[PDB]
């Protein structure tokens, strides 16, 4: 082997997060919303949209837009007007400093400097560029000019579970190798004024938040040097059954403008439980220990909406507890794409260290990392905690 | 390991290729392009045209767009008008159905059910969607809803050795993996009228021409059963020094918009030399045979122009047959972004046979795939070849 490999698995050695420092509380956002874009007369589109957010299970959000962005750039408060010139010039340029800021998070905690990174995935729904967000964020970084780089593009809400997918056979194939992965998603790219023949952009407009969250992922650890929190073990993709034209997402002129054709938390609620019971029967085949019990896993589950929790939790009898961490970045943050499971699985280390309990995954060993989007695409993703002291 | 690994070298276990059926020569091209963009008039910008093409040592290209398009389409014709959902329309559907004619001659060729295939690496420079052109591949081919996919967008020129690089670790870090490797590129993307403001745009209207290419790459060939072709032995990426902004790609309302900022080939050829002895260095180390000399190494060079290829066998001192697989394909189809480095690949193996050489490289051991695009990135492979009956 002319390229030595590693030996252990794929290992979570750090995370930071960033998110915008403007922040609009849910229970103003009707109000900013629907005046931001000249859209108050629209009496009953405006009691839609209440209801949605009184629905959505988001308290606040942090957004790159803000007020005074907006009234200087109209065409981002119109509704389909040309403005993809306008959302690419910033987001080509904020997505990647945003992406700086978790990235620089999560080499401070690993401690090691930055040249000992050797591959960078960065994934992104926001904005294209050639070169790319990879490129501009290793250079915002100052990292090594070989290093190895990989841009995901118009991933969308799955790209989460992508990103480790990949990172994965990055680290466990090439001996020394350190992958700094980093998601970075802000909603400028698809912010649009409110219109009664679009109600999918509402939903985003309810849901969609910013941030950015990174990873140090490498095989092998070096013992008393770099910490491990979160192993890869397992991976998997599926596209859900009859579920053609489920989400859709196309970069127009306009801007990106996502449509919804079918009933994602019915499709991905009645199809989760054959695909995590197969993953578990491929992680533990019998020949041998069974599987853990669903309520003995810990879970990193993209809420995509608050009905899709409802409707997982519902069909697979998860006891209450079990999406609370990913409830709780739901609650604070909103969805924020492919970025959302590296935030809930920072809530869940940190929960775990904080209250003292046995490892990284809120006392269990094994857990799950879904990512649902455009496909209907859902990556799984099995997990091994870390015991703490 | 929950998920066994695999142990040989990733390898080249067939190759297939598509273009679109109109071809367009090159002696025509001037009339033809400046005919359809009703720009015969512009007499020094013709003239001007005319002489990059005598120069772009290219003999004929395969074009998706046609006179009957593009009498049409006419906002593709002029130069500077919105065109991108138009653009996006085409791209969106053709570029996975030709990586589908690809890829229906490479399973042919490897001969295993279309249901072997685990993973799906598909990357493209003309157009972005979700899902992505990978979803879309998958689907045209009836894969197993299960597959492993990855689109790499808005990649460019260094995009074959990106999608080899990517391969490696997917196939030898997963026992059992079978690769399939898509690269499809249609200039409708960026085919726009001429303009004396961006002569940038009449090289790519020199050089650029349409393709897909596909590999199936795994690791332990099936002894009598799979054929490797060629091994995929050592990666390295390199963002070129004081090259920023050489190349720059922007997706823009007016389509996709190339600008060079700086000298291409003397970027290259002045700090590819340095790439290459480190890379062979580190493919054999002293301690043990010595790197084989650049003359007994086999050569994939991705044709960005001819001055980039002229210029590197300057410097590197190559003896004159050593490009000759590399100027055969750019002679034939021009420069087809990320495809074109797999179509050499395929035109070296297809050479080699016919002529019984000892060798899939034409009768050397070892070899070099290099791509290089926006960054200034410069992608290496070292290679191995498979010796022939």
Same mark, same amino acid.
């Given at each position: 082997?002319?390229?030595?490999?590693?030996?252990?698995?794929?290992?979570?050695?750090?995370?930071?997060?960033?998110?915008?420092?403007?922040?609009?509380?849910?229970?103003?956002?009707?109000?900013?919303?629907?005046?931001?874009?000249?859209?108050?007369?629209?009496?009953?589109?405006?009691?839609?949209?209440?209801?949605?957010?009184?629905?959505?299970?988001?308290?606040?959000?942090?957004?790159?837009?803000?007020?005074?962005?907006?009234?200087?750039?109209?065409?981002?408060?119109?509704?389909?007007?040309?403005?993809?010139?306008?959302?690419?010039?910033?987001?080509?340029?904020?997505?990647?400093?945003? !992406?700086?800021?978790?990235?620089?998070?999560?080499?401070?905690?690993?401690?090691?400097?930055?040249?000992?990174?050797?591959?960078?995935?960065?994934?992104?729904?926001?904005?294209?560029?050639?070169?790319?967000?990879?490129?501009?964020?290793?250079?915002?970084?100052?990292?090594?000019?070989?290093?190895?780089?990989?841009?995901?593009?118009?991933?969308?809400?799955?790209?989460?579970?992508?990103?480790?997918?990949?990172?994965?056979?990055?680290?466990?194939?090439?001996?020394?190798?350190?992958?700094?992965?980093?998601?970075?998603?802000?909603?400028?790219?698809?912010?649009?004024?409110?219109?009664?023949?679009?109600?999918?952009?509402?939903?985003?407009?309810?849901?969609?938040?910013?941030?950015?969250?990174?990873?140090?992922? !490498?095989?092998?650890?070096?013992?008393?040097?770099?910490?491990?929190?979160?192993?890869?073990?397992?991976?998997?993709?599926?596209?859900?059954?009859?579920?053609?034209?489920?989400?859709?997402?196309?970069?127009?002129?306009?801007?990106?403008?996502?449509?919804?054709?079918?009933?994602?938390?019915?499709?991905?609620?009645?199809?989760?439980?054959?695909?995590?019971?197969?993953?578990?029967?491929?992680?533990?085949?019998?020949?041998?220990?069974?599987?853990?019990?669903?309520?003995?896993?810990?879970?990193?589950?993209?809420?995509?909406?608050?009905?899709?929790?409802?409707?997982?939790?519902?069909?697979?009898?998860?006891?209450?507890?079990?999406?609370?961490?990913?409830?709780?970045?739901?609650?604070?943050? !909103?969805?924020?794409?492919?970025?959302?499971?590296?935030?809930?699985?920072?809530?869940?280390?940190?929960?775990?260290?904080?209250?003292?309990? !046995?490892?990284?995954?809120?006392?269990?060993?094994?857990?799950?990392?879904?990512?649902?989007?455009?496909?209907?695409?859902?990556?799984?993703?099995?997990?091994?905690?870390?015991?703490?002291?």
């Amino acid at each position: 082997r002319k390229m030595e490999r590693a030996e252990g698995p794929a290992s979570v050695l750090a995370i930071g997060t960033a998110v915008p420092p403007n922040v609009v509380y849910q229970k103003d956002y009707p109000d900013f919303y629907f005046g931001v874009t000249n859209s108050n007369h629209k009496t009953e589109l405006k009691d839609k949209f209440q209801r949605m957010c009184d629905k959505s299970c988001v308290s606040k959000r942090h957004l790159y837009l803000t007020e005074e962005i907006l009234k200087a750039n109209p065409s981002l408060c119109a509704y389909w007007e040309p403005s993809l010139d306008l959302r690419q010039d910033i987001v080509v340029v904020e997505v990647p400093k945003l !992406g700086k800021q978790a990235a620089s998070a999560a080499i401070k905690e690993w401690g090691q400097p930055k040249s000992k990174i050797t591959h960078l995935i960065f994934c992104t729904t926001s904005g294209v560029d050639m070169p790319g967000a990879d490129w501009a964020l290793a250079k915002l970084l100052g990292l090594r000019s070989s290093v190895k780089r990989l841009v995901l593009y118009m991933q969308g809400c799955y790209g989460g579970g992508t990103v480790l997918r990949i990172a994965k056979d990055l680290a466990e194939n090439n001996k020394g190798a350190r992958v700094l992965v980093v998601c970075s998603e802000i909603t400028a790219i698809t912010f649009r004024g409110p219109s009664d023949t679009h109600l999918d952009s509402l939903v985003g407009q309810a849901l969609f938040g910013d941030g950015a969250s990174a990873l140090i992922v !490498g095989s092998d650890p070096v013992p008393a040097v770099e910490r491990a929190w979160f192993e890869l073990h397992w991976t998997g993709s599926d596209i859900l059954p009859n579920s053609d034209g489920a989400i859709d997402g196309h970069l127009k002129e306009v801007g990106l403008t996502f449509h919804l054709m079918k009933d994602v938390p019915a499709i991905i609620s009645k199809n989760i439980g054959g695909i995590l019971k197969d993953a578990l029967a491929k992680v533990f085949p019998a020949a041998a220990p069974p599987p853990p019990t669903y309520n003995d896993l810990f879970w990193i589950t993209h809420p995509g909406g608050p009905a899709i929790l409802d409707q997982v939790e519902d069909r697979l009898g998860l006891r209450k507890d079990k999406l609370a961490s990913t409830r709780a970045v739901l609650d604070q943050f !909103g969805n924020m794409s492919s970025a959302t499971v590296l935030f809930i699985m920072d809530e869940m280390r940190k929960r775990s260290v904080e209250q003292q309990l !046995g490892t990284t995954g809120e006392g269990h060993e094994w857990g799950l990392l879904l990512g649902f989007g455009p496909g209907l695409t859902c990556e799984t993703v099995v997990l091994r905690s870390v015991p703490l002291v």
